[PDB]
Design a protein around this ligand. Structure first.
Ligand SMILES: O=C1Nc2ccc(F)cc2[C@@H]1O
Ligand SMILES: O=C1Nc2ccc(F)cc2[C@@H]1O
Ligand SMILES: O=C1Nc2ccc(F)cc2[C@@H]1O
Lengths: 281, 281, 281
């Protein structure tokens, strides 16, 4: 199924008939960081499997729902269960839910993820406002836009220099200051590792030489589809470790350690993003 | 359809029956840089769609013709409408037209493209003689030769150290000097960005660290197929902008700005390449 | 055919019925470096084409056998004819033979390859104990684990920091010292070039900047599948040339020159690895 205008239009028609909500904000929450979705008001839960033309997610399993409702007086749509390219999904499968958001009226997309720290100033538990990226799959002929261009959504050759909205970064920082946790908040460049292996010790050292501040396996595909069709983006990484220190000390990361950091910061991130949604222009 | 000996042979037989031209020079012109093809003498235009085993190009649309005839007394074949890997074409689709050129008798392939400047000495409107490349798709398992080797055309493991003929670079420079535009002409290393997004500001900074002088989304796949089967190559980039300066100043590129630079240099490039064809050994 | 538990189990059942050998050591030998396999004792040769669910290898051709028997009193299984991703094999085809080794009881995998030298201390004929890697395909969305995870074999997100066992590296060095060829033996980081073109002169210079010591087109996919399912690895490169010196001097490599270096070191490598097998804990 191609992520074209006709196919996205059929999915949007179903969603509108079932939910009665017209959202102007979309959210994609990182692993272990989804508690906000369980606080959406007057909400409607829609399994992906019920939506015409949505990608099949049963091989990977686990939760996959679209959730619509209200937060802080604002109308939102959330992806509960995000799709990752290391699972084998195609370009078209990743893009179609973002283009459905566009047709539903979304103007701003808020994203969180878990990432490894490269910059020596970053420690476990820190947050990074993403200000740019290095797309290793894109340089290497695996960009999410490889294929025919879908002209109704955007141009053949997108400019990504303003993909990460500067005013949304400022608002996120302002709220952290108001609540006295600004000592946790940095800005930085995100490296997209296709995955699913964690960067090796020598890959981490290479990323440091190339000016990367953090590394993860998500986010850049959605950002590019959103920028192509004119949706503004804020993206925030939660740092689980510093891979450069780990390489110097011969220490390892694993998924268990990552999820324990997510649990330690989940409630603060939930409150932060509730206020961001409330304050959006 | 595989780019094998039998399939390329059938396409070549059709072309020979229709055109009566046996070319020893091939040309592939970059976007907005195709006016020379409209000056080919006693010419024959052959739509791709008419040629057995040529790749289907109707999803992308726009022009797709093989043009045969004479320039400066020399017999040439031109691709009018080049295939780009960011459109989703396979390795086999890109390679088959180059291998048909080989079977028709082509010994020299001349290529132009539009590119972004990385080296700080490069400005909008400059020309770069390509002397080497950095193939990000090839390091990353998307080389144009991934697949069975077609032994009739070349070896399993090609050496690319002489892919860009030094004597053709010297002849191109000599002609620029004769016409007093040598102040526009540089040499440099071409980075292959799979595309279709322009390099991000932080990707540009990374390319500078790695010794890249220019960046584009074409040319390296054709160069590798030509080198594999023993065709000599000259490749020239027209620089639309300097991406490093743009990153420092928070300024953007787009396709409209690129095509306006092409229009400004098209007539000089046309005259330059007509003389190169005339003077080839 | 997916590299899942059921499919690997059927291949292992066939092998056990035919060979009567239960191996705890596996070996994969590099090109021109396979003579040890012809010295396996009380051996059984099994063509790939006879084994249920083994990948089809007839397009590439040449030898493809599983060989079981005894070396130095130890029970081993060898791949005679290794699969390379530049031939077009999928992730699933590369992984299935390694997962069959796991089900047969393999606990240690020994690997050799031919590689180009990047580090200025490396010369033709030197050996490199691999201590880490830089996986360009993996950063670029062509990791061998992209796809559904096969949970019976390993975790969704593997940690590769101990992929190259330190004690096996020490044992290999100890034996070289005992036989007074330790002046040939280095350690270093392996860059995975997807291939099949040799790294270009400007790619070599880039690899030097990024901290790579050697470059090759194999080994990293098998290492990652082995690490995922808990098999210990020793991997050794035989250096055919120094690509940085060749770039400075405008000299070329080719497959003929590579195989001549393999012939010159084959007998020493055979004796070295026989002793390693004999001495394994
Ligand atoms: O590539 C990755 N490395 C890494 C390390 C730690 C994390 F919490 C998350 C990731 C990223 O997905
Ligand atoms: O990757 C690319 N960047 C870029 C920038 C400006 C151009 F005129 C052309 C391109 C290349 O196709
Ligand atoms: O990528 C490669 N370069 C290279 C150079 C020389 C070799 F003997 C082997 C290789 C590797 O397969």
């Amino acid at each position: 199924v191609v992520a074209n205008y006709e196919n996205a239009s059929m999915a949007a028609d179903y969603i509108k008939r079932v939910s009665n909500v017209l959202p102007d904000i979309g959210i994609i929450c990182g692993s272990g960081l989804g508690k906000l979705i369980e606080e959406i008001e007057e909400r409607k839960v829609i399994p992906y499997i019920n939506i015409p033309n949505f990608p099949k997610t049963t091989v990977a399993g686990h939760v996959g729902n679209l959730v619509l409702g209200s937060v802080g007086g604002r109308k939102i749509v959330a992806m509960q269960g995000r799709l990752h390219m290391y699972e084998g999904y195609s370009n078209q499968e990743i893009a179609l839910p973002i283009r459905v958001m566009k047709l539903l009226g979304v103007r701003v997309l808020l994203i969180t993820n878990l990432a490894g720290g490269i910059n020596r100033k970053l420690k476990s538990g820190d947050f990074v406002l993403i200000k740019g990226h290095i797309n290793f799959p894109g340089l290497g002929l695996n960009n999410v836009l490889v294929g025919p261009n879908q002209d109704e959504f955007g141009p053949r050759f997108p400019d990504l220099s303003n993909a990460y909205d500067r005013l949304l970064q400022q608002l996120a920082l302002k709220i952290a200051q108001e609540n006295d946790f600004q000592d946790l908040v940095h800005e930085g460049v995100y490296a997209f590792n296709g995955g699913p292996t964690y960067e090796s010790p020598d890959e981490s050292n290479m990323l440091l030489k190339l000016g990367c501040d953090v590394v993860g396996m998500s986010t850049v595909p959605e950002v590019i589809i959103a920028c192509h069709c004119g949706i503004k983006v804020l993206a925030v990484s939660l740092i689980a470790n510093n891979s450069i220190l780990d390489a110097e000390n011969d220490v390892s990361i694993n998924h268990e350690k990552v999820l324990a950091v997510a649990e330690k910061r989940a409630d603060l991130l939930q409150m932060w993003f509730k206020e961001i949604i409330t304050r959006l222009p």
